[PDB]
Amino acid sequence: ASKVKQDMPPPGGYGPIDYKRNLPRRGLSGYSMFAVGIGTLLFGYWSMMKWNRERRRLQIEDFEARIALMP
Amino acid sequence: KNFSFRIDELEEMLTNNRIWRNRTVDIGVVTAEDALNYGFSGVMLRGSGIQWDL
């Protein structure tokens, strides 16, 4: 005496189902990354130049200590 | 409604990877005429440009 009951889609329909590709760009420009790399290299070069000059001075100092002790 | 994002993740892993393209591009190339004569069907046809779907 009841209505016919069956597995049916809801009245109206279903919400949209996405199927198309989604691969967003999400990236910097090439110039930006190249510039960051070059700037990092230059900063490292300057730091290493200072440190190596100081190291050469220290080496000279301890070499002179050896020279003083040699006789 | 959620399977598309899984496809997107798989495609992020494989499609643009240069190792994947180096392993798959120009490997096992078959011509349309040879595919038709050798009895191929499905994607093995449609990969050669043959416009056929049952």
Side-chain angles (χ1 to χ4, degrees), chain A residues 16-24, chain B residues 1 4-5 7-8 11-12 15-16:
Chain A
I17 286 170
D18 279 14
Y19 61 93
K20 270 172 195 173
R21 193 194 255 180
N22 207 279
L23 305 178
Chain B
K1 80 196 289 302
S4 191
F5 263 48
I7 309 178
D8 284 336
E11 192 131 48
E12 213 50 90
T15 275
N16 287 315

Short mmCIF file of all heavy atoms in Angstrom, two decimals, chain A residues 16-24, chain B residues 1 4-5 7-8 11-12 15-16:
data_model
loop_
_atom_site.label_atom_id
_atom_site.label_comp_id
_atom_site.label_asym_id
_atom_site.label_seq_id
_atom_site.Cartn_x
_atom_site.Cartn_y
_atom_site.Cartn_z
N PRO A 16 27.92 19.28 -9.29
CA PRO A 16 28.88 19.02 -10.37
C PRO A 16 30.07 18.21 -9.89
O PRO A 16 30.55 18.37 -8.77
CB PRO A 16 29.29 20.43 -10.82
CG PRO A 16 28.99 21.30 -9.64
CD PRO A 16 27.77 20.71 -9.02
N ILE A 17 30.54 17.32 -10.76
CA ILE A 17 31.70 16.48 -10.49
C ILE A 17 32.83 16.97 -11.38
O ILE A 17 32.72 16.97 -12.61
CB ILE A 17 31.40 14.99 -10.74
CG1 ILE A 17 30.53 14.43 -9.62
CG2 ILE A 17 32.69 14.20 -10.87
CD1 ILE A 17 29.99 13.05 -9.89
N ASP A 18 33.92 17.41 -10.75
CA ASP A 18 35.08 17.87 -11.49
C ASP A 18 35.79 16.70 -12.15
O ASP A 18 35.96 15.64 -11.54
CB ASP A 18 36.05 18.62 -10.57
CG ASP A 18 35.63 20.05 -10.33
OD1 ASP A 18 34.47 20.40 -10.64
OD2 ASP A 18 36.46 20.83 -9.81
N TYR A 19 36.19 16.89 -13.41
CA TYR A 19 36.99 15.89 -14.10
C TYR A 19 38.18 16.45 -14.86
O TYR A 19 39.10 15.69 -15.17
CB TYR A 19 36.13 15.08 -15.07
CG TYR A 19 35.48 15.90 -16.17
CD1 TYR A 19 36.10 16.06 -17.40
CD2 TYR A 19 34.25 16.51 -15.97
CE1 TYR A 19 35.51 16.81 -18.39
CE2 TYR A 19 33.66 17.26 -16.96
CZ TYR A 19 34.29 17.40 -18.17
OH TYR A 19 33.71 18.15 -19.17
N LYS A 20 38.22 17.75 -15.16
CA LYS A 20 39.29 18.31 -15.96
C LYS A 20 40.59 18.40 -15.15
O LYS A 20 40.60 18.38 -13.92
CB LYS A 20 38.91 19.69 -16.49
CG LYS A 20 38.23 19.66 -17.84
CD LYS A 20 37.70 21.03 -18.22
CE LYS A 20 36.72 20.93 -19.38
NZ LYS A 20 36.07 22.23 -19.65
N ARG A 21 41.70 18.49 -15.89
CA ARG A 21 43.02 18.54 -15.28
C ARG A 21 43.19 19.82 -14.47
O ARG A 21 42.67 20.88 -14.83
CB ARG A 21 44.08 18.46 -16.38
CG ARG A 21 45.49 18.19 -15.89
CD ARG A 21 46.49 18.48 -17.00
NE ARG A 21 47.01 17.26 -17.60
CZ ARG A 21 47.90 17.22 -18.58
NH1 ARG A 21 48.38 18.34 -19.11
NH2 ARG A 21 48.30 16.05 -19.05
N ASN A 22 43.94 19.72 -13.37
CA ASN A 22 44.26 20.88 -12.53
C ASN A 22 45.73 20.76 -12.11
O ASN A 22 46.05 20.11 -11.11
CB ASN A 22 43.34 20.97 -11.33
CG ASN A 22 43.18 22.40 -10.84
OD1 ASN A 22 44.04 22.91 -10.11
ND2 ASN A 22 42.09 23.04 -11.23
N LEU A 23 46.61 21.39 -12.88
CA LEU A 23 48.03 21.47 -12.56
C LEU A 23 48.44 22.93 -12.55
O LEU A 23 48.94 23.45 -13.57
CB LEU A 23 48.87 20.68 -13.56
CG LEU A 23 48.53 19.20 -13.78
CD1 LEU A 23 49.44 18.60 -14.84
CD2 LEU A 23 48.61 18.41 -12.49
N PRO A 24 48.25 23.64 -11.44
CA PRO A 24 48.50 25.09 -11.42
C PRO A 24 49.97 25.42 -11.65
O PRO A 24 50.86 24.61 -11.39
CB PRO A 24 48.05 25.51 -10.02
CG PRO A 24 47.17 24.40 -9.54
CD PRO A 24 47.74 23.16 -10.14
N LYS B 1 33.21 12.68 -6.83
CA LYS B 1 33.51 14.09 -6.68
C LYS B 1 34.90 14.35 -6.13
O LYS B 1 35.32 15.51 -6.08
CB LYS B 1 32.45 14.76 -5.79
CG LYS B 1 32.66 14.56 -4.30
CD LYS B 1 31.39 14.89 -3.54
CE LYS B 1 31.13 16.38 -3.53
NZ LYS B 1 32.26 17.14 -2.93
N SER B 4 38.97 13.09 -8.99
CA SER B 4 39.72 13.95 -9.90
C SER B 4 41.00 14.47 -9.26
O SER B 4 42.02 14.61 -9.94
CB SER B 4 38.85 15.11 -10.36
OG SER B 4 39.46 15.82 -11.42
N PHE B 5 40.97 14.76 -7.96
CA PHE B 5 42.17 15.24 -7.30
C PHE B 5 43.23 14.15 -7.18
O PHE B 5 44.43 14.44 -7.24
CB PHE B 5 41.82 15.81 -5.92
CG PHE B 5 41.65 17.30 -5.91
CD1 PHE B 5 40.88 17.92 -6.87
CD2 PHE B 5 42.27 18.07 -4.95
CE1 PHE B 5 40.72 19.29 -6.87
CE2 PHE B 5 42.12 19.44 -4.94
CZ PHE B 5 41.34 20.05 -5.91
N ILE B 7 43.60 11.82 -9.50
CA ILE B 7 44.18 11.85 -10.85
C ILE B 7 45.16 13.00 -10.98
O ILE B 7 46.23 12.87 -11.60
CB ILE B 7 43.08 11.93 -11.92
CG1 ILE B 7 42.01 10.87 -11.70
CG2 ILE B 7 43.68 11.78 -13.30
CD1 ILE B 7 40.88 10.95 -12.71
N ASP B 8 44.82 14.15 -10.40
CA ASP B 8 45.70 15.32 -10.45
C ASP B 8 47.03 15.04 -9.76
O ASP B 8 48.08 15.46 -10.24
CB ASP B 8 45.01 16.52 -9.82
CG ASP B 8 43.96 17.14 -10.72
OD1 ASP B 8 44.06 16.96 -11.95
OD2 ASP B 8 43.04 17.80 -10.20
N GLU B 11 49.12 12.77 -11.93
CA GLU B 11 49.63 13.54 -13.05
C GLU B 11 50.75 14.49 -12.62
O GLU B 11 51.70 14.70 -13.37
CB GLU B 11 48.48 14.31 -13.70
CG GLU B 11 48.80 14.91 -15.03
CD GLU B 11 47.75 14.60 -16.07
OE1 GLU B 11 46.55 14.78 -15.77
OE2 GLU B 11 48.12 14.18 -17.19
N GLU B 12 50.64 15.06 -11.42
CA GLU B 12 51.73 15.86 -10.87
C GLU B 12 52.99 15.03 -10.70
O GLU B 12 54.10 15.53 -10.89
CB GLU B 12 51.31 16.47 -9.53
CG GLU B 12 51.90 17.85 -9.24
CD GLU B 12 51.72 18.83 -10.38
OE1 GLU B 12 50.69 19.52 -10.41
OE2 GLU B 12 52.63 18.92 -11.24
N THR B 15 53.48 13.20 -15.21
CA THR B 15 53.30 13.72 -16.57
C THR B 15 54.48 14.57 -17.02
O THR B 15 55.02 14.38 -18.12
CB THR B 15 51.99 14.50 -16.66
OG1 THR B 15 50.92 13.60 -16.91
CG2 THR B 15 52.05 15.52 -17.78
N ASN B 16 54.91 15.52 -16.19
CA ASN B 16 55.95 16.46 -16.58
C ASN B 16 57.34 16.07 -16.10
O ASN B 16 58.30 16.79 -16.39
CB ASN B 16 55.60 17.87 -16.09
CG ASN B 16 54.47 18.50 -16.88
OD1 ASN B 16 54.45 18.43 -18.10
ND2 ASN B 16 53.53 19.11 -16.17
#
